[PDB]
Amino acid sequence: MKGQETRGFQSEVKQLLHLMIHSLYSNKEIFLRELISNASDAADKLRFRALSNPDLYEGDGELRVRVSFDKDKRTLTISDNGVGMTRDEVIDHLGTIAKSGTKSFLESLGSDQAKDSGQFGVGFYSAFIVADKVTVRTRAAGEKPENGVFWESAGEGEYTVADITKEDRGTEITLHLREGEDEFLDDWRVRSIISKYSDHIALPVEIEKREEKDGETVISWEKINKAQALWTRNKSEITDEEYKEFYKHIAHDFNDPLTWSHNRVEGKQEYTSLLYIPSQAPWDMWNRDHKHGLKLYVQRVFIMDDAEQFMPNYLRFVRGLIDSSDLPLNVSREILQDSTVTRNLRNALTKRVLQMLEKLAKDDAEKYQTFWQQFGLVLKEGPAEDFANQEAIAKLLRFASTHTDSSAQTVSLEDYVSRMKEGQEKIYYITADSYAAAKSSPHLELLRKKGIEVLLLSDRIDEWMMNYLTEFDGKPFQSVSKVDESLEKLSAKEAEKALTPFIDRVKALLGERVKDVRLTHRLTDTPAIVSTDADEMSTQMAKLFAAAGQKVPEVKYIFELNPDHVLVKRAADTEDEAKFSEWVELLLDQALLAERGTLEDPNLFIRRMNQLLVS
Amino acid sequence: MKGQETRGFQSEVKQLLHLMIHSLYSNKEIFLRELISNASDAADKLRFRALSNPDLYEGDGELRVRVSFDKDKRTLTISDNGVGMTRDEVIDHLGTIAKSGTKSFLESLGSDQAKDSQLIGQFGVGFYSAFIVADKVTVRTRAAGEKPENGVFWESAGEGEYTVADITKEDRGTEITLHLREGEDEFLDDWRVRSIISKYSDHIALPVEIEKREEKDGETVISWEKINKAQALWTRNKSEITDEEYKEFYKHIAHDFNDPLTWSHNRVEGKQEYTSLLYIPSQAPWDMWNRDHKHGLKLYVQRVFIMDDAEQFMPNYLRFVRGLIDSSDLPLNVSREILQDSTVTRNLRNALTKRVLQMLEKLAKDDAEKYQTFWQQFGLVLKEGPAEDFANQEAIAKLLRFASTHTDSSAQTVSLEDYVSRMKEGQEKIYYITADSYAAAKSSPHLELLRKKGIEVLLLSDRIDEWMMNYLTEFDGKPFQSVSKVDESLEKLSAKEAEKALTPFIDRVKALLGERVKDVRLTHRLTDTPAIVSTDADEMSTQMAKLFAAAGQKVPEVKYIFELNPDHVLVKRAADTEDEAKFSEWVELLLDQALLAERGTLEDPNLFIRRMNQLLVS
Ligand SMILES: Nc1ncnc2c1ncn2[C@@H]1O[C@@H](COP(=O)(O)OP(=O)(O)O)[C@@H](O)[C@H]1O
Numbered sequence A: 001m002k003g004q005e006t007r008g009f010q011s012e013v014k015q016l017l018h019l020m021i022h023s024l025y026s027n028k029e030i031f032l033r034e035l036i037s038n039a040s041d042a043a044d045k046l047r048f049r050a051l052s053n054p055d056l057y058e059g060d061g062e063l064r065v066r067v068s069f070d071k072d073k074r075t076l077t078i079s080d081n082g083v084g085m086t087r088d089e090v091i092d093h094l095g096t097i098a099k100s101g102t103k104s105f106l107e108s109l110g111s112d113q114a115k116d117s118g119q120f121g122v123g124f125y126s127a128f129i130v131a132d133k134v135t136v137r138t139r140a141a142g143e144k145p146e147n148g149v150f151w152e153s154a155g156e157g158e159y160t161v162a163d164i165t166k167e168d169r170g171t172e173i174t175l176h177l178r179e180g181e182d183e184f185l186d187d188w189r190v191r192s193i194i195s196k197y198s199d200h201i202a203l204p205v206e207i208e209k210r211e212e213k214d215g216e217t218v219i220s221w222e223k224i225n226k227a228q229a230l231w232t233r234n235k236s237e238i239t240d241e242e243y244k245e246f247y248k249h250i251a252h253d254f255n256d257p258l259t260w261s262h263n264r265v266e267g268k269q270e271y272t273s274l275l276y277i278p279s280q281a282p283w284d285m286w287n288r289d290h291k292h293g294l295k296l297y298v299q300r301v302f303i304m305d306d307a308e309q310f311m312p313n314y315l316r317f318v319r320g321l322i323d324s325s326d327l328p329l330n331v332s333r334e335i336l337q338d339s340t341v342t343r344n345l346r347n348a349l350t351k352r353v354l355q356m357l358e359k360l361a362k363d364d365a366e367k368y369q370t371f372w373q374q375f376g377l378v379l380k381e382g383p384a385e386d387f388a389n390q391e392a393i394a395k396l397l398r399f400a401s402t403h404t405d406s407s408a409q410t411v412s413l414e415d416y417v418s419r420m421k422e423g424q425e426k427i428y429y430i431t432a433d434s435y436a437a438a439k440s441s442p443h444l445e446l447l448r449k450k451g452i453e454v455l456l457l458s459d460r461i462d463e464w465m466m467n468y469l470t471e472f473d474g475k476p477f478q479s480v481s482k483v484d485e486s487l488e489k490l491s492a493k494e495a496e497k498a499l500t501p502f503i504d505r506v507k508a509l510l511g512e513r514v515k516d517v518r519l520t521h522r523l524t525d526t527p528a529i530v531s532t533d534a535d536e537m538s539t540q541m542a543k544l545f546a547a548a549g550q551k552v553p554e555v556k557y558i559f560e561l562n563p564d565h566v567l568v569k570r571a572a573d574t575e576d577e578a579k580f581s582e583w584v585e586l587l588l589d590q591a592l593l594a595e596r597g598t599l600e601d602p603n604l605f606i607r608r609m610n611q612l613l614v615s
Numbered sequence B: 001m002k003g004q005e006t007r008g009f010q011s012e013v014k015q016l017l018h019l020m021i022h023s024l025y026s027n028k029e030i031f032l033r034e035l036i037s038n039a040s041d042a043a044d045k046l047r048f049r050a051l052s053n054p055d056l057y058e059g060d061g062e063l064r065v066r067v068s069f070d071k072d073k074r075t076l077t078i079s080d081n082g083v084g085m086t087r088d089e090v091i092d093h094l095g096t097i098a099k100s101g102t103k104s105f106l107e108s109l110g111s112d113q114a115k116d117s118q119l120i121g122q123f124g125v126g127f128y129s130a131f132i133v134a135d136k137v138t139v140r141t142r143a144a145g146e147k148p149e150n151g152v153f154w155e156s157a158g159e160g161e162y163t164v165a166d167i168t169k170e171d172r173g174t175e176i177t178l179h180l181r182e183g184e185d186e187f188l189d190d191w192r193v194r195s196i197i198s199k200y201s202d203h204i205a206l207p208v209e210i211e212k213r214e215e216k217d218g219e220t221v222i223s224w225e226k227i228n229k230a231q232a233l234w235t236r237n238k239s240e241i242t243d244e245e246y247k248e249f250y251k252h253i254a255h256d257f258n259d260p261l262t263w264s265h266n267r268v269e270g271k272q273e274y275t276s277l278l279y280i281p282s283q284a285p286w287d288m289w290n291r292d293h294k295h296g297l298k299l300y301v302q303r304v305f306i307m308d309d310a311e312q313f314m315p316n317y318l319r320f321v322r323g324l325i326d327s328s329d330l331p332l333n334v335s336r337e338i339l340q341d342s343t344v345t346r347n348l349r350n351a352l353t354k355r356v357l358q359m360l361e362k363l364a365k366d367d368a369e370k371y372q373t374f375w376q377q378f379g380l381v382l383k384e385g386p387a388e389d390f391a392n393q394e395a396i397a398k399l400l401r402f403a404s405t406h407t408d409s410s411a412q413t414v415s416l417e418d419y420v421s422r423m424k425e426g427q428e429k430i431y432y433i434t435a436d437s438y439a440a441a442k443s444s445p446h447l448e449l450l451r452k453k454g455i456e457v458l459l460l461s462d463r464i465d466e467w468m469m470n471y472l473t474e475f476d477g478k479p480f481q482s483v484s485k486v487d488e489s490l491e492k493l494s495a496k497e498a499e500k501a502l503t504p505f506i507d508r509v510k511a512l513l514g515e516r517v518k519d520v521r522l523t524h525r526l527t528d529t530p531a532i533v534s535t536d537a538d539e540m541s542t543q544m545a546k547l548f549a550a551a552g553q554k555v556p557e558v559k560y561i562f563e564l565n566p567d568h569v570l571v572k573r574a575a576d577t578e579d580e581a582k583f584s585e586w587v588e589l590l591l592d593q594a595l596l597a598e599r600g601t602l603e604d605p606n607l608f609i610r611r612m613n614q615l616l617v618s
């Protein structure tokens, strides 16, 4: 009680209050609606101020208003851990009364309504309709605990204000009840009153429950809005069917979910989250910015159907709903996109989703396959679009490769390294327009012969993904379509040779069309085969430019020939200039079609071969 | 004045009105705001009722409220072609007074406010405001739909008694004639009235027109002048705007910075009523090919903004069209939902689609240079049209453009007209090839004969073409046929000297292959291609199969018809060889050879090659 002060006005102010407050005499019970409300606005206000300077919570997350009693000293004590008032605030609000109150009262005065008639609303001072001493202790978030404020009043023209201390933020309204009004010590009656409000109110209202049992008299706090909330009953009450049914409902889909993660986070930010992974990518999947899924609730209340915001694009299949508290109701997409809390909440959830997937892949690779069937093409965005997890994503990735004679893709990157052979340092992949070309490329035949596992990438986004996905578990990625100096020496030497003459003859004949001509011990039954390395525009990269419809960039190709194949030698020998020309030409076109895939003239190659057969 | 009747309900009602109406005495001018408003709600109400039963307009589109005078009989006549009242309506509204008026007046009564001073300028009376400056209000009105004889008359002195009578007026709406009071000559000044009304007109919903006369050209004219002018670059008619002005505009309302290739800006009076301005961009933006999101059309209502961007007034195959349409008589407050419930949408859409297509046709008459740039940018979209909007499949197909034999540039510039134009005598059909790429098209086996005789063939290389054709059936009397399907029309179409017949050969291939090819034949598709494979017979065509492939379903079985060229080396040379293994190798090489040239993306270039390998090795 330091710095005490009585501010203590007069005359028929003393009277005026014994007027208005008494006007409410018909529906006294109002004073609850009014006080409970104030406690709401308190919290939500604090919530909002905590979108920013995070430490405004001082740790304690749960915001609640608690109604307690004393059938002894006959007190009814409403208290909230809201934002609370400072000293000035106190004296300027509690100090005065209710601007809207007096106002609508005054302009009401003297009208038939006014004179001959419960129609009204005073404010905070409503309390004095059932109290004869209102005693406020409070301290406002942020302020050192010593900056508390005391406010007693008789509900006349004079109140007392004093600096106190309380090591626990919020507002403690202690009503000293009047003779007669014992009706408001019935924790029931209070309950039943407040219940009508609590479906507009913004806050947990907890009521003191003194129930005696075991001989020992316990006091619980009973939240009077239990909340019909299938994402509230913890993971040990719910049926797998219950979950399934739920997702069904809030998805307008009717297949079962493949899996779900439903958790509850206390602490920094505070929220109950439930997420599903569907089994059937809907229609909209690959259209529009419209991403749906996440329903955002605030305080077990509905805000918006659907924010794409708490989900990164490469998981825009995730359905479900997150239910925040400590996110201020009234929030909307804009407001979120201005706060940081969004950034954080997003990231956390992304973790939760990825985990949920990892586990699905441990526990039911049957179902999980069905997942990757449905969504893999989306998850393959991930690596380009959230480096912070490029690991825990890549694991989730799945591929088709050499050691699997099936279009379907089921190869884990783990499953790759696992059955890697001793000494093998790199992870090899081919990138073609189609599974076909992949499985059956010239670049394949050696590795496929030695048995080495090659990866079969047939989706256009792959030619994208790789550029970012660099290296898994210590083993970097390399591509068969790019002849390296590592495989350049993999066993083959007993009796060498040299077939220079016509290779310089091919070099001369072609000119700049191919950047180089060589032999290569890529001893596939394939005669000729064309590559490009040297940090130049790779072949599918070109096709990618084609596919986004820009000028297909020039390819610097490296013609390679197979010294151990019929047609290689047989053309190599012929000494007719016209015939030979026809032959090396047939060989190149042959290799081209096998690389550039969609050969921009299958006829032309054919026609050259036609003549080579005709004449 | 048929069926006349004087009703009145009395007492200190006669007095009560000389109370409230007189409460407004401070700001008499109010009676304008009030009447003008009523005329607004009138129109907009009618507008809304005309989202449905279309004929509610009786033709006449422009909705306006007109203030006229008479410095003679001292009348001020406000009139609207709004929705108007029926008889019951009259007696139930005009008949009584003002519910909100009396109400807020009553609960006001006896309070300090009420008592003192000119606070009496608080208790807002309604229609009856008129009697604050009138001493005789005379209403003639008839409500949309009702036969013109169901008009209603309503005179009143502004006491407790009004007269109502059935009259007739062959012109919908509400005619409020105020008989002005001694003193209040202030409201015959067409100016003062104007200047008053101007403050309102920025919330009002309607054209307010004032009677503006001048003895000019010797003669005294009466022009109706509108109060607001509207800063509206789509209002000044086509004879008051700069090509730069237009260009700048599109730029702005597109967030694009290239110039438009063309525009159509017109004004429709009549059934539905609206000023439309549309542009054809020069650069298809990013979003072009993937969004449940069209943009472009900005919908204004009464020179007011409604929504940025509707996709209901444009069909998909023109979703590049940018611009804005400005309806009147589309009821403001309308939104996508409401439109998609009305029919007016259906109609408005269709009309615009016409206007767009026309705008294009003309572009193709008057600057084929630019138009090419158009088709470069948007053709792939316009090629949806034929499958989408049968009602114009003509005026679309003309706009279509292709590459064909009688050019050898990848670029496509051939009008269908340009095709038939240089068709040869007797040639009845229009031929096309459908390949994965310009290459294959230009250089297909099916080509070489037609290309030799000189006959123009169409080179379709985009995947949607294999779609479009199925619907685009026949242009200007000449049906479409495809080279990839050997018909019995070209089957008989030059220099045939020595003739005979092979049979051991053809039947030996038939036996060797079995069911793999449905038939084996010769064909005078004579040219430097040996073997070539087709199918006809109303069976699954080749690209149709590829289309199933491309939507990723089980690639349906193709019933192929092997054909051979009796006049080519390799044809004969394999034909003669009598070794069973060698010959097998040869007919096999011939088939694989033809396959790759049809099925294009040959699902094993190696396999064909390997067969040829052996045919060269051993
Ligand atoms: N539990 C509370 N926590 C923080 N401020 C409160 C609390 N209860 C009342 N207040 C403050 O007092 C109110 C304003 O005072 P006033 O305008 O005089 O009307 P009244 O005091 O009746 O609500 C609220 O606006 C709020 O700022």
Ligand SMILES: Nc1ncnc2c1ncn2[C@@H]1O[C@@H](COP(=O)(O)OP(=O)(O)O)[C@@H](O)[C@H]1O
Residues within 6 Å of the ligand: B038, B039, B042, B080, B082, B083, B084, B085, B092, B093, B094, B096, B097, B098, B099, B125, B126, B127, B128, B174
């Ligand atoms: N020009 C008008 N056209 C159609 N109805 C009108 C017109 N002017 C007044 N009304 C009708 O009369 C009004 C209702 O009457 P009422 O409730 O007694 O108040 P007031 O007559 O003063 O507007 C409007 O709601 C409207 O329906």
